[PDB]
Amino acid sequence: EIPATVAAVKNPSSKIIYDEHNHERFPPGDPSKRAFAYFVLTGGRFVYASLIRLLVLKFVLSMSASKDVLALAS
Amino acid sequence: GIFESLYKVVMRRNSVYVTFVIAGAFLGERAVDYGIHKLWEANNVGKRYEDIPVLGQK
């Protein structure tokens, strides 16, 4: 009849069970794999920086001179 | 191992990380451009402007 939350608070157990339905945890003991995630994010940032740079340059060069006036210069 | 060592080298400092991000973006864009240009030239053989049999015979 003891509340579940009260029993969980008053009984700190070493064996902790997570959901694990869509995220399979690493076995207890293996080191955290944070370098791999950071490098995946780094590749994504490579991609995002490329897109931002090309968009900015596209807008600037569109506002720049055009082929018609460039050719009329001779 | 390799990932951890590279993480140390290019992420000990955030400024170094940003510099590496910019350099990697530049290099990856260049490599992608090179690969796509090679694919385009391999696919479109004999149709390029330089491939026209007559160019100064007019």
């Binding site: - | 400092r13 170094v16 940003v18 973006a25």
Partner: peptide, 24 residues
């Protein structure tokens, strides 16, 4: 920090050379 400021200046210069790309 002097070193931090220098590294951030290097990063900003690299970003500027990536954007403008003077003589690649």
């Amino acid at each position: 920090d002097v070193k931090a400021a220098a590294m951030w200046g290097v990063a900003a210069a690299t970003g500027g050379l990536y954007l403008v790309q003077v003589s690649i």
